[PDB]
Amino acid sequence: PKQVTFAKLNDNIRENFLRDMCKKYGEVEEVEILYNPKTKKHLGIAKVVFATVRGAKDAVQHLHSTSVMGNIIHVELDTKGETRMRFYELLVTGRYTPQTLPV
């Protein structure tokens, strides 16, 4: 369980921002913001894979439900990205918006 899913990220948070915020908790191996692949709209969700279990755990512990860039973000362990997959489906089809995603 080294993979973490972020949700309700402000659309001014891209890879450099999220990498910087996650490196405080441990080495970071992959960071990816998800977009609508046609319109390029930021969907507020992201994948981060940490080098260690401890990095992912500490990042979730200290970032979940914190105020970042003016709203409360959602951060959770997502071992195979299945939770983020459901988030993606709902967001990229416009069933919800990035800030109204049920979490």
Coordinates of C-alpha atoms in Angstrom, one line a residue:
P1 CA 0.0 0.0 0.0
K2 CA 2.3 2.8 -1.3
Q3 CA -0.3 4.4 -3.5
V4 CA -2.4 7.4 -2.4
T5 CA -5.3 9.0 -4.0
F6 CA -6.0 12.7 -3.6
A7 CA -9.4 14.3 -4.3
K8 CA -10.9 17.8 -4.4
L9 CA -7.6 19.3 -5.2
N10 CA -7.7 22.9 -6.4
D11 CA -7.2 23.3 -10.1
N12 CA -4.0 25.3 -9.4
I13 CA -2.4 22.1 -8.0
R14 CA -0.4 20.2 -10.7
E15 CA 2.6 17.9 -10.5
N16 CA 5.2 20.3 -9.0
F17 CA 2.8 21.4 -6.2
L18 CA 1.7 17.9 -5.3
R19 CA 5.2 16.4 -5.5
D20 CA 6.5 19.2 -3.2
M21 CA 3.7 18.6 -0.7
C22 CA 4.1 14.8 -0.7
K23 CA 7.9 14.8 -0.4
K24 CA 7.6 16.2 3.1
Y25 CA 6.5 12.7 4.2
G26 CA 8.9 10.5 2.1
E27 CA 10.4 9.9 -1.3
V28 CA 7.9 10.1 -4.1
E29 CA 8.0 7.8 -7.1
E30 CA 5.1 8.9 -9.4
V31 CA 2.7 11.9 -9.4
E32 CA -0.1 12.2 -11.9
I33 CA -3.0 14.7 -12.0
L34 CA -6.0 13.4 -13.8
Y35 CA -7.7 15.5 -16.6
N36 CA -10.5 15.2 -19.0
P37 CA -8.3 13.9 -21.8
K38 CA -10.2 15.8 -24.5
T39 CA -11.0 19.2 -22.9
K40 CA -7.9 19.1 -20.6
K41 CA -10.0 20.1 -17.6
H42 CA -8.4 19.4 -14.2
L43 CA -10.5 16.9 -12.4
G44 CA -9.2 17.5 -8.8
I45 CA -8.0 13.9 -8.4
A46 CA -4.5 12.5 -8.5
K47 CA -2.3 9.5 -8.0
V48 CA 0.8 9.5 -5.9
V49 CA 3.1 6.5 -5.3
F50 CA 5.5 6.7 -2.5
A51 CA 8.8 4.9 -2.2
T52 CA 7.8 3.4 1.2
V53 CA 4.7 2.3 3.0
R54 CA 5.6 4.8 5.8
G55 CA 5.6 7.7 3.3
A56 CA 2.1 6.9 2.1
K57 CA 0.7 6.3 5.6
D58 CA 2.2 9.6 7.0
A59 CA 1.0 11.5 4.0
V60 CA -2.6 10.3 4.4
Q61 CA -2.4 10.8 8.2
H62 CA -1.3 14.4 8.0
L63 CA -2.9 15.6 4.7
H64 CA -6.4 14.0 4.7
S65 CA -9.1 16.5 5.5
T66 CA -6.7 19.5 5.6
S67 CA -7.3 22.9 4.1
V68 CA -5.2 23.3 1.0
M69 CA -5.6 26.1 -1.6
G70 CA -8.9 27.1 0.0
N71 CA -10.8 23.9 0.3
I72 CA -10.7 20.7 2.4
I73 CA -9.0 17.9 0.5
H74 CA -9.6 14.1 0.6
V75 CA -6.5 11.8 0.9
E76 CA -6.7 8.0 1.2
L77 CA -4.7 4.9 0.6
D78 CA -5.7 3.4 -2.8
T79 CA -3.5 0.3 -3.3
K80 CA -4.6 -0.4 -6.9
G81 CA -6.3 2.9 -7.7
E82 CA -9.7 1.4 -7.6
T83 CA -11.2 4.3 -5.6
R84 CA -9.7 6.9 -7.9
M85 CA -11.1 4.9 -10.9
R86 CA -14.6 5.4 -9.6
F87 CA -13.8 9.1 -8.9
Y88 CA -12.5 9.4 -12.5
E89 CA -15.7 7.8 -14.0
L90 CA -17.9 10.2 -12.1
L91 CA -15.9 13.3 -12.9
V92 CA -14.8 12.8 -16.5
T93 CA -18.5 12.1 -17.4
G94 CA -19.6 15.2 -15.6
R95 CA -21.8 13.4 -13.1
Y96 CA -20.1 15.6 -10.4
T97 CA -17.6 18.4 -10.5
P98 CA -14.2 18.3 -8.8
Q99 CA -15.4 20.2 -5.7
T100 CA -18.8 18.4 -5.4
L101 CA -17.4 14.8 -5.7
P102 CA -19.0 12.7 -2.9
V103 CA -16.1 11.5 -0.8

